[PDB]
Each structure stands twice: as structure tokens, then as C-alpha cells.
Amino acid sequence: SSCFPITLKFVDVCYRVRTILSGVTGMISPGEFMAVLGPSGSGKSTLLNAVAGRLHGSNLTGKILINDGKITKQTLKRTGFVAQDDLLYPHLTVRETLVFVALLRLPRSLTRDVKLRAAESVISELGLTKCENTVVGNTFIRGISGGERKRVSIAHELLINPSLLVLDEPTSGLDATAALRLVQTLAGLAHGKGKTVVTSIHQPSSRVFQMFDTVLLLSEGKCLFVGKGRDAMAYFESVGFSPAFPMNPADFLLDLANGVCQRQTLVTAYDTLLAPQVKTCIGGGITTCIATWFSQLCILLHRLLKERRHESFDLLRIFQVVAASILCGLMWWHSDYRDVHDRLGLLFFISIFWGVLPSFNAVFTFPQERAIFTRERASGMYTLSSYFMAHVLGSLSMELVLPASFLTFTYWMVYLRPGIVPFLLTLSVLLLYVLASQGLGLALGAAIMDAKKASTIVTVTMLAFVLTGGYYVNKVPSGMVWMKYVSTTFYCYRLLVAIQYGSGEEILEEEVIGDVGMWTSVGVLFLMFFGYRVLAYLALRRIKH
Amino acid sequence: SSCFPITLKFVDVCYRVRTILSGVTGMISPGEFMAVLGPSGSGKSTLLNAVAGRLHGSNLTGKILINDGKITKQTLKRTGFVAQDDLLYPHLTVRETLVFVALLRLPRSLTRDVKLRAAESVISELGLTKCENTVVGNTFIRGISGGERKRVSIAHELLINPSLLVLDEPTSGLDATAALRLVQTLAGLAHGKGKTVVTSIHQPSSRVFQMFDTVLLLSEGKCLFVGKGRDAMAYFESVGFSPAFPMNPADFLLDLANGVCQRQTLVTAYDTLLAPQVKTCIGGGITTCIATWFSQLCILLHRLLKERRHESFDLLRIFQVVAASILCGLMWWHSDYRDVHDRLGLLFFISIFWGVLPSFNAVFTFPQERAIFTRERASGMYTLSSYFMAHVLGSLSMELVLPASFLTFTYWMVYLRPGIVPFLLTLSVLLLYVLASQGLGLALGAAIMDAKKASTIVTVTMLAFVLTGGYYVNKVPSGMVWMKYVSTTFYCYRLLVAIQYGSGEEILEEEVIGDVGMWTSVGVLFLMFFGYRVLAYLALRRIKH
């Protein structure tokens, strides 16, 4: 219950890029709820973002100090920044969202019994105890309300028990009566638990402004007032400013910020009477560290299990595989093998279809989760190498179910080779070709990080793999014959003809007998399996935070 | 300057679907600016939407009367409803947005000289005279600000010179100083031009509330107050309600609406003293009507000219045609004609490529403009049959430029038949096949009106057109031989072989000699040109308003 108070002080100076801040000074006591209010463009989104400790070094000079000391990464585990946008996964319920977060945030030396009841204490500490089985959703999946998405985001940050909670415009997008009941619980933290809540309200209401203990005006840099907030109106009356009509106190002193009198004399009056009074108050880790890698993998596989299933077994993607499998069983119904030219066109349609679908659907995976990943990683929850291996191991499970259902339905209708040993070789070649074609699309989406531009580069790439696959053109013109050795469609189609026909000898046009080999064609699809996953990792470690 | 005043009166009763409204009475004088404010769910979005005249008949009973009469379509040309969302075209500048609207809204009997200076009077009557050459844009195209998108929407409605302007939450999404300067011009209309502006502000500010002449509270049905707005605070003081702390007057009396005292005694006190005092105040057209059809077509072709060009000459669609034309000229470089099997696979790749691209890109045209069309049509600007023929005639101009550039580059590299009469027959067959494949996608998107679901039904349809086109399967199994006669890819590929080879006789495998005919293959692609445009119209007149 916060038996470690943080007395935040800051006497900093400008933050340039023009100056955003210029001269801000102030101090925050434990047990106070403070609002930082000002016009749009006054740098209130930077004073919060530089007193949590997220801006430093180059163009930020000052003497920000926590607890009469220095802002250190030791005194940054007791600090929580609730940002302005919410980044949650949709298909998880509210209770299992905060249990997956509680197993990753809280340290390893505890047990899994004082760790998942610290996640259902925060359920009842905020108001999230009625909606704990509703899914979260988004604006395509019906779930919790917009005032309870913000309460999950604050509950995401209270699991580590901070002593300083910085929030960046919480009540933005909330209606009139949920923005009031969210200020009631943030004022209850600082008055009941002894924390040091600091927030920046955009345009406060009339009875929201009564819930504050301290305000701080910012007008394009320097500050005009810092004080109790019940005596802000009486202060400017002594300077000679009073409203002409009954009005909100937070509309009055925010009009005085952007020059509208009812801003040159206001700054000079501040550094004569009020600013020189707040200045007066101024041998292991080898075998365990590999075992902590795999528990981060076992939790990241269970979180993303319903996310790797929504995109895989989509209902408009089941319809495309069921439609393509009735058309193959009807155009090649009860086929004969003694007419080679139709049997080779069946086997080449399977190479086109299962190279285009896994590659095109794989370019959307990494661009859509870049914002969630770079926030979740820069708080010490996981690294790149365990998030990457949860997408690798979780996507080669789900994507083998629709090609195995295509080939059970179609193999025995179209009369391919009878036997259990030719059926299992045709299935094995096709499931390796689907995994080698997926990795082409994973590498292209990670190198580009735009879903529209990556979609037209995997489309152009597969066009050159189909045309060099060996079915349309018989005599490649002598400077383009090298190009077929880099395509995945070439090695699959030359394998499938080797199961069904072998090398002549029963059917003897020598488009059956090839020029590659069989172990050379399965040794290269393994090189393209691993090789396109290594290049997807290196394109992702290039986005240096 | 509004020399026709409208004195709006309404003594209506409930509007059910539960009751939304219950007992509302009131009257509006000319020259008054009135706000309709209340909590979210109190039916203030229906009292406006039923006093403009957009709700009537079944479950709406009352005695709404304009100018001591009856609400008639004669007295509805002097009425303007500014809705809550803005539906504009992005690539147009602000000046030519309001000139294209001025040629369609203002009547035909004027000239085109007192019609396009009535569109640059409204430019300066509002504040749209500095940004009149900036494009409008959206949130993908950088253009005008969000407070000036709302001023174009009010300028869209002032061209007909109304005398009663009803606005539905104008200042929603605007910041603090643009919401004030938009109320300054709406208060200037009613105080300077004599109009009868009626609006519904969501959460007014402190000095926005000083700009009102009349308010009307609504609490879930019945009304609590209607009066001057400068004496709303003194009225509830006589009922026994006063604030305990200095506050916005529009936050106080909106908390009294949803029950929070500082709502059962408030309604009963209204129908004793205040409600029985507002009740006391209570032979041509044949040759001209075809000439007015084509001027609506000549303006709708010029509006949409930059919209049919942004989607056609997209930069990621030029790259796909330039890439596919280097790969054809390189895999078939300097080809020989005496080897028939490679020449037939070239001609079938052109049939696949130019059937898949026009059909897939055409399903997005009509779903993305359904909201703009059904608003713009139910105000008497155009009909369905002139909006349809501007999309038909405007899309068969732009989509013939990339297939003509594909075939100029590639025909002479791959060594097809030399001559000017075989070159112009190959170009003519391909440009008819692109127009017949576009109309398949126009008909599917108009029948479904969802872009995701229509994209997987044109993809399944073209898969059955490719497999029955006549290249992969040689011997179709006796109950599927009918199916090739409905595919567009069949008739194109059998035409292209007839230009290049004829019927044997120089090359004599009889996959050259077909079974259809030549005039039978061009008579059916014309039947699929017109036939897929008739079905797209009938699917669009099915959405009955």
C-alpha cells in the first residue's frame, strides 16, 4: 500500500527540437492528485513525458530529481506511465488479459499462487469485477466499453505496485459521467493508498475541477500558476483579472493562458511573488536463464493462440479452400494416368495455389503488431527472440490444417496413385512447400512494415516464380535459364512428378524426366525454410527501438 | 437575404419505435439562434430530425406546423439540414467543390453567370476565402482543417438560400477556439440575415453558452425548460435548485436533467407555471427533359474525373503492369512460331492476367460511395440512371491505357505475327475482353455492397473461368463440358489463337482448330459487356432508399 513515498521535484529548463518548454519549476508531494492543464501546443505532453523519465540526454537539460536524489533506473520500477492510446489484444477476456500480463510483469522468484491473485486484486481495486468475462474487442468485435478499456490500461500498470503514476490525458473520448467516475478512482488512489498521481486533463468539467488538489498552467512554455487550485481564482483577482459572467473556473484561467484577457504581464507577475516561494521548498545465470526463456515462450504461445486462430480459420478463407477442392475433383474426376498432359497440369495447379495463399497472408502479421510490441518490449516483458519464436512455432501449427483437408478430399476422387506410401509422400512434399512459401511472406513484411506495399511485392515475386516454374515455357532463352533455381514453385512441381511417374519406364515428350534430382529438391526447400526465417529476424532487429 | 420568415411551431407528442420523445412543445421565431441541449440518449437527435421533416407517418404523431400551416414539400425548399458526418470528395479543391455543387443544386432556368458567382459569394459569406485552392483531402490526403470541412458542409446547404437551417451537433471534434468561431458565424446568420438557425450543441463551453438566445432541455423524453437562457439559472432557483460551487451554467442544468440534484418534481413543476404560457403563444417536357439528362452527365463526368484517375493510375498498379511486361518479353524473347506449345501458353497467360486485374479492382467502386450517393440523391441533385452512366462512361476511358501499353511493348519483342492488320486485331480482342471482365466485378460489388465479401466471390468465380478456359484440362469429363460456355477466358483465348494461327494449314495436336467460331466468340463478349451492366443497375435500384 505504497510504504515508499516519492517526493518528485523538478527545476528544469527548456526542451528544444524553437523551445517547447522554457522555465518550468515545481514539486509534487506524496498523497497529492495533481492536474497539468493548458492549451493545445503548450508542452504539457512533454513535461509529463520528461518527468516519468522517457526523455533525456541530448536537448533536455535540467535538474529533475526524484526523492532529493537523481532519476535512476533503480527508482524507475516504482513509476508507471499510462500512455494515451490503448494497445490490447481483442480476443482475450478481461480476466485472462490481466493474468497473462501478471505472469510476464511480476518477477520469476515468486510462485504462481501469489501472482494470479495479485491480478484479481487489481480486478476489484478498480471497477473491473462485473465485466471480467466479456471479451475486450475493438471496433469490429463487440466487447467492453470505452471507459473500461482505459481501466484495463491502468490495471496493466498497477500490477507492479508503483508509487508514482503518470497519466497522459485519460478522460479523452469518454462521455460526461464516465469521465467523472474515472477521476473518482484516481483521486481515491492518492487519498487512500498514498500514491503520487499526476495527470493532464484536456478540458475539465465543473465538478471534475473540484476533485483536484493542485493545478499547473502552461502557456507555450513557461508556467503561470502552481498552487492549491481552490485559490487560483483569488490569485488572479489580486493581479487584476476577474470574469464578467458566471463561468467554469477551468475555462477562465485557460483563456488567460492563450493571451485572451477578461500573457506578457502574467509571466512577469509570476516571477515576483509566487515563484520565489516554491523555490524555498526546493555464481549462477546460465542454466536458469535458459529456463526463463522457455517460460516466456509458453506464455506467449497461449496468449496468441486465439489470435493465430482468428486469422487462420477465417470463414472467408475456409470458403476459398472448399471451393477450390470441388473444382479440382470435378474437372479431373476419375482421371486416367495414361494421358500425361492432363496429369501434369493438375500437379502444377496445386503448386500455384499453395504458394500464392500462404505467402500473401503472411505479410500482414508483423506490421499490425509493431505498436503493441515496441511498447510491451520497452518495459521488460520479453525480448525479440522469444516474441519471434512464438510467431514461428504458432503459425506452423495452424496453417497445416487446410492443406491437409484439401488433399484428403481430392486425392482419391481424381484417382492419383493408389497406396499408402505414395499418399504420404504427396502430403509431405505439400506441407513442406506451404512452410517454405509462408517464410517468403514473413521476410517481405518485416523488411517493409507497410501492408499495402508488401502486398504488391509478394505478388510480383510469385509471378516470376510461376513463369519460371517449368510448365508454360519449354525453351527458356539462354540468359534466363538460371532464374528457375531460385523459385519455390520449381522444386515442388518437380518433386510431385517424381512421386506420380518416377522417371519414365512405365509411361515410355520427356517433360517427366527432369534435370535436378530428388534429394537436391528437398535439400533446397529446407534451405528456404530456415533461410527466409533468418532474414525476417534481421529485418526486425533493424528497427532500433 | 431571407425575405420570407419561417415561424416554426411544434406541439407534438411521442415518437416510439419504448418512447423516445414524450410531450415536447415549443415555438421558434425568425431571427433567433436556439440550442437544443440534453444528455446522451434524451432524443435531441430526433426532435431536430423530425422538425426538419425527415421523420413522419407511421410512429410519429403530432401537430408540427411551419408558419401556421402544414409541413409541405413546397415549404421544404426553404429548409436546410446539416447532418453530423461530412461526405465530400477528397481530390477536389474547395472552390471547385462548391462550383460543381452549385451547378447541380441551383435550377436550370438560370444562366451560368449568376450561378457560379452565387458559389463565390458563399465562399466569402463564411470564412472559406483563404483556403479556396487547398484540396479537401481526408485522413490519407493532406488538405483543409477539420473546422473548415464543417464550413464546406454548411456552404453545401446555403447555396439554395434557406430560411431555416437545422444543424445536428456541428462543434463535435473541433477544438476550443474553432468551436467558438463557428458559433460566431451561426449567431451572425440569425442576427444579420434574419434566418432561423436551430442546433443541438453537445457540451457547450462557458462563453459559447453566452451566444445563445434560447435553450431547450430534454431529459429522456419530456422537456424541463424553454426560455431565454439568460434566465434559466434564476428559474430553477425559484424551484429550489442552486449550485454549491462556481460552475458552468450548462453543466448545472444538464446535471438536473439526468436526475442528479444539487427529475420527477422538475417535470411536474414545468406543467404548472411555464408550460401554460408558451401554449398561449401557439405543353413541354419531352425534348428538354432529355437535354437536362445530359447536362447532369457532363457535370458528373468532370467531378469524378480526378476520382476515376486516382484509382486507375495508382502508382502500385503501374508497377504491376511494368513488371509483368518485362517478364513476358524476357521469357519469350524473339520466340519462334513453329513450336506451337509455347506460343499457346503465352496467349493464355494474357487471358489470365487481363481477366483477374479488371474484375478484382471493380468490386470496390460502388460500396465506397453508397453513403455519399444516397445523401446526394435524396436532395434532388441527380438520379440513379445518370450517376450510373457517369461511372460506366468514365471507367471505360481510363482502364484502356495500361493494356494498350502492355501490348505495344511486348508484341514486337516476343515476335508475334508481323503486320499492321494482325496487330490491330490482337489489340481489339484484348480491349473488349478487359471491358467484359470489368463488368463482372461491377455486378458483384453492387449485389453485395461489402468489399471483403465481394473480393472472395470474384476470386472463386475467376478460378472456375480459368480452369474451364481450355488450357489445363484436355478431356473434360462429360458432365462438365457445358461449363466452359459461360466463362470470359474461354472466348478470349479462342480468339487470340485464330489471329495468330488461323485454322492449321501452315502449321500442319489439333488444339489450334477449335469448336466455336469467330463471330460467335465476339458476339458473346458483347452480350457479356451489356449483360453485366444491366444486372449491376438492377442490383442498385434494389436498395430502396
Ligand SMILES: CC1=CC(=O)CC(C)(C)[C@@]1(O)/C=C/C(C)=C\C(=O)O
Ligand atoms: C501469380 C499471380 C500473380 C499475378 O500477378 C496475377 C496472376 C493472376 C497472373 C497470378 O495469380 C497468376 C496466376 C496464374 C499464372 C495461374 C492461375 O491462377 O491459374
